[PDB]
Motif scaffolding. Structure first.
Motif, PDB file in Angstrom:
ATOM      1  N   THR A   1       0.826  -1.219   0.000  1.00 44.81           N
ATOM      2  CA  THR A   1       0.000   0.000   0.000  1.00 44.81           C
ATOM      3  C   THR A   1       0.859   1.267   0.000  1.00 44.81           C
ATOM      4  O   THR A   1       2.043   1.219   0.313  1.00 44.81           O
ATOM      5  CB  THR A   1      -1.005   0.002   1.164  1.00 44.81           C
TER       6      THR A   1
ATOM      7  N   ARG B   1       1.019   3.353   2.245  1.00 48.30           N
ATOM      8  CA  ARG B   1       1.526   3.491   3.613  1.00 48.30           C
ATOM      9  C   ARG B   1       2.679   2.509   3.844  1.00 48.30           C
ATOM     10  O   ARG B   1       2.478   1.314   3.616  1.00 48.30           O
ATOM     11  CB  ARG B   1       0.415   3.268   4.639  1.00 48.30           C
TER      12      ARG B   1
ATOM     13  N   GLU C   1       1.207  -3.981   8.106  1.00 48.50           N
ATOM     14  CA  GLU C   1       0.688  -3.150   7.022  1.00 48.50           C
ATOM     15  C   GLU C   1      -0.765  -2.740   7.302  1.00 48.50           C
ATOM     16  O   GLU C   1      -1.416  -3.265   8.204  1.00 48.50           O
ATOM     17  CB  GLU C   1       0.779  -3.897   5.683  1.00 48.50           C
ATOM     18  N   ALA C   2      -1.306  -1.817   6.504  1.00 50.06           N
ATOM     19  CA  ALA C   2      -2.689  -1.359   6.657  1.00 50.06           C
ATOM     20  C   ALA C   2      -3.732  -2.484   6.499  1.00 50.06           C
ATOM     21  O   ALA C   2      -4.787  -2.428   7.129  1.00 50.06           O
ATOM     22  CB  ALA C   2      -2.929  -0.235   5.642  1.00 50.06           C
ATOM     23  N   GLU C   3      -3.447  -3.495   5.666  1.00 49.04           N
ATOM     24  CA  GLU C   3      -4.375  -4.589   5.335  1.00 49.04           C
ATOM     25  C   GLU C   3      -3.922  -5.967   5.859  1.00 49.04           C
ATOM     26  O   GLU C   3      -4.565  -6.976   5.568  1.00 49.04           O
ATOM     27  CB  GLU C   3      -4.660  -4.608   3.819  1.00 49.04           C
ATOM     28  N   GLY C   4      -2.848  -6.043   6.652  1.00 49.28           N
ATOM     29  CA  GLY C   4      -2.344  -7.324   7.149  1.00 49.28           C
ATOM     30  C   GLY C   4      -0.965  -7.255   7.794  1.00 49.28           C
ATOM     31  O   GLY C   4      -0.585  -6.270   8.428  1.00 49.28           O
ATOM     32  N   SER C   5      -0.207  -8.342   7.687  1.00 43.91           N
ATOM     33  CA  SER C   5       1.175  -8.407   8.159  1.00 43.91           C
ATOM     34  C   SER C   5       1.993  -9.387   7.339  1.00 43.91           C
ATOM     35  O   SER C   5       1.449 -10.327   6.758  1.00 43.91           O
ATOM     36  CB  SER C   5       1.232  -8.822   9.628  1.00 43.91           C
TER      37      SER C   5
ATOM     38  N   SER D   1      -2.723  -8.789  12.391  1.00 39.60           N
ATOM     39  CA  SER D   1      -1.591  -7.925  12.734  1.00 39.60           C
ATOM     40  C   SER D   1      -0.625  -8.637  13.676  1.00 39.60           C
ATOM     41  O   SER D   1      -1.005  -9.024  14.783  1.00 39.60           O
ATOM     42  CB  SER D   1      -2.049  -6.583  13.300  1.00 39.60           C
TER      43      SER D   1
END
Lengths: 151, 119
Positions: A74, A76, A100-104, A125
């Motif tokens: 992303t 970010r 990350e914004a949507e996972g790890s 996360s």
């Protein structure tokens, strides 16, 4: 017994200006917390992390051994949340948990080449990582694990 | 600069390898040099190396703008441009400073048919 005091044995061993600049570049993102720990392994390492930046220093000399800036899927940048030393096949590296914004992502970072060598997407996360064993197979050394994990 | 074979009578020939865009080649007749962006002092090679294969000579140039360029001598064209700051932990200050202390070395393995570049 009333005041045991520590005695300083040397001057402050400053990190290289490049390591200090790299850790400060992400203080501009108001949410980036600078973290650091000593490694528990025999390799005398310390690590510092600020947002996507990872810095690896000698735990005695403060010299920069290795460094990496993690990229995210992303816009970010990922945050380095968890770091553990991992030694495998006569290599020395780190297991790194990225949020990350949507996972790890779980990364295996090889210090000797200063690169990620394996990465795995995680369901949720990541908060901590811990190595159980650094090799596989039907050895005497894996006999303490469940028959499943020995594969 | 090209000298003839030592056992043959011939003239010294000179060729200048320049990065000309196909657009700069097609527009060569219609716009003055002030808009063309002359290759600034920043394109200057700081380190040069060469590799000869079959009947062609490949020149590698590490420049003050921190870019590595590859040239065919036979076809007189830039075959490759790579930005060396893609591989450095960039401080914003380096992109503004000319890279004067840079060095380039080449090594070729005959056994593998592989060319390596040390920067």
């Amino acid at each position: 017994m009333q005041n045991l005091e520590a005695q300083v044995t040397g001057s402050l061993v400053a990190f290289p200006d490049v390591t200090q600049k790299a850790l400060k570049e992400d203080e501009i993102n108001l949410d980036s917390v600078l973290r650091g720990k000593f490694s528990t392994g025999r390799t005398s390492l310390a690590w510092l992390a600020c947002g996507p930046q990872l810095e690896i220093t000698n735990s005695v000399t403060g010299e920069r051994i290795s460094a990496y800036h993690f990229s995210g899927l992303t816009e970010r940048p990922p945050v380095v949340v968890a770091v553990k030393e991992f030694t495998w096949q006569k290599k020395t590296g780190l297991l790194v948990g990225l949020v990350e914004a949507e996972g790890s992502v779980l990364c295996l970072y090889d210090i000797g080449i200063s690169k990620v060598v394996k990465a795995v997407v995680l369901p949720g996360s990541v908060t901590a990582v811990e190595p159980i064993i650094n090799h596989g197979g039907a050895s005497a050394s894996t006999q303490h694990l469940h028959q499943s994990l020995r594969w | 600069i090209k000298m003839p074979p030592h056992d043959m009578e011939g003239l010294v020939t000179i060729a200048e390898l320049k990065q000309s865009s196909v657009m700069q080649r097609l527009l060569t007749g219609w716009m003055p040099s002030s808009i063309r962006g002359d290759q600034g002092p920043a394109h200057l090679p700081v380190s040069l190396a060469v590799h000869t294969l079959d009947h062609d000579s490949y020149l590698f140039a590490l420049c003050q703008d921190h870019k590595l360029r590859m040239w065919s001598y036979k076809d007189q064209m830039c075959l490759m441009v790579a930005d060396m700051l893609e591989y450095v932990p960039v401080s914003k200050d380096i992109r503004q400073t000319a890279g004067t202390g840079h060095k380039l070395r080449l090594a070729f393995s005959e056994t593998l048919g592989i060319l390596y570049l040390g920067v």
